[PDB]
Amino acid sequence: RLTELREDIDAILEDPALEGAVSGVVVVDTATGEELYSRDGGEQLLPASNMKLFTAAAALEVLGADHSFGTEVAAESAPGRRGEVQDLYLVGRGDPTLSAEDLDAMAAEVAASGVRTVRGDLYADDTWFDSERLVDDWWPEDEPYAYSAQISALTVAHGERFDTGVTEVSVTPAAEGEPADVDLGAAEGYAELDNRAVTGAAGSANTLVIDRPVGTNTIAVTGSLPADAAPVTALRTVDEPAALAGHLFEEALESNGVTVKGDVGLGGVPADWQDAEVLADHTSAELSEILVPFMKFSNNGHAEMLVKSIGQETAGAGTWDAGLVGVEEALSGLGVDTAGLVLNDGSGLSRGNLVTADTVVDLLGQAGSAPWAQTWSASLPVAGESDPFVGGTLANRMRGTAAEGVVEAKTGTMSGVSALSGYVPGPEGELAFSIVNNGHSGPAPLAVQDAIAVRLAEYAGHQAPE
Ligand SMILES: [Mg+2]
Ligand SMILES: [Mg+2]
């Protein structure tokens, strides 16, 4: 039965989609330690989003499953008779799930604590992390897109997926030949609008492009939207997530009867504030719950914020340098051999990252026997599951195969990089596998990945749901 599987995987790795690609494929029985399959296991390869596996493990190790994140509002002193304060600080400590709703709830707390007037300015404080918004080797053309959002300790998360540092742009067609209507969402009044888009004739081609040109906080909309087209919605990043948070909080204050007379900007709580008055605060859900939308949907901002939070925890430095060393140390401390790990970020977006398939499976084995194994396991996309919060990036892969409902694995993709690594829960024993592909010139080898993962599921005794 073992030689059957090995022959089968060997035949899967023959697929012409892996023409000129390197592939790290390792399968280990986690109960025995038996190496079921190993090809190019020690080879160093970009992991893409599989880097999140290391980040998630480390974050659970360093911060704990029960770790939560805080945001607060501070004035130099409490409001008096007149209910007045001077300057006001919204302070973010790295909550990657901070919503506009949470901002409104804090705005109400500010109101209810007796503030009627912010006579000075409103400042957005994200100094808990450094102001290095983007990893060096990340590509500037990626910057407009949600997965490349700027990293800040104070950032507003959009939606139930908590996509950080973005706004939702809605483009609605008007009459043919009239400008399309562009609604900027949260960044209305914050980001700049450059709407050059038109409504094309009904039945015409949709050529709508929504950009944020590099180094601006302008949403540039170009192209044409057909008169009869459904509205278009896209997540677009903004410059300075904290300042958008500031802007949104300003509106939340005005909405809860708090008049803000000054300006909204970045600034940190001054050193010379002896006893800052916390007028509002908010506590995130615990990391174990945050791990779900992070890992299911592969949230890049979450990963990076978690690296900086690790940096803060191990070193009081909300920093990639410190956080990445913190990941490496936490992984070593877990028994993981990190010899082949090059860490350049937490998300796996950076092309400076390296792993080996051996390292991943090493990690999977180590994570499996950890006190947080289950929260870690629960965060992983489950093959073929319809519920996006269950199936995540594997929602529409391996449906109607033995893998459906059983294989828990993290996906990874970008140009010339693809990865699938996780567990195949066995009525035999729990298998761990890592499939990392670099180089392939055409379609990502998702069917190869699925083929292996399906074969492993069958091998572990599973059968396709019908
Ligand atoms: Mg606004
Ligand atoms: Mg099943």
Curated annotation (Swiss-Prot):
Residues bound to substrate: K410
Name of this chain's protein: D-alanyl-D-alanine carboxypeptidase
Domain of life: Bacteria
Function comment: Removes C-terminal D-alanyl residues from sugar-peptide cell wall precursors.
The keyword Secreted appears for this protein: yes
GO molecular function: serine-type D-Ala-D-Ala carboxypeptidase activity
Region (Absent in class-A beta-lactamases): 97-270
Similarity comment: family membership: Belongs to the peptidase S13 family.
Entry's localization field: Secreted
Organism: Actinomadura sp. (strain R39)
Main location (coarse class): secreted
EC number, UniProt record: 3.4.16.4
GO biological process: cell wall organization; peptidoglycan biosynthetic process; proteolysis; regulation of cell shape; response to antibiotic
UniProt feature coiled coil, ranges: none
UniProt KW keywords: Antibiotic resistance, Carboxypeptidase, Cell shape, Cell wall biogenesis/degradation, Hydrolase, Peptidoglycan synthesis, Protease, Secreted, Signal
Modulation of this protein's activity: Inhibited by benzylpenicillin, cephaloridine, ampicillin and cetiofur.
UniProt xrefs under InterPro entries: Beta-lactam/transpept-like (IPR012338), Peptidase_S13 (IPR000667)
Pathway: Cell wall biogenesis; peptidoglycan biosynthesis
Keyword check for Signal: yes
Pfam families, A to Z: Peptidase_S13 (PF02113)
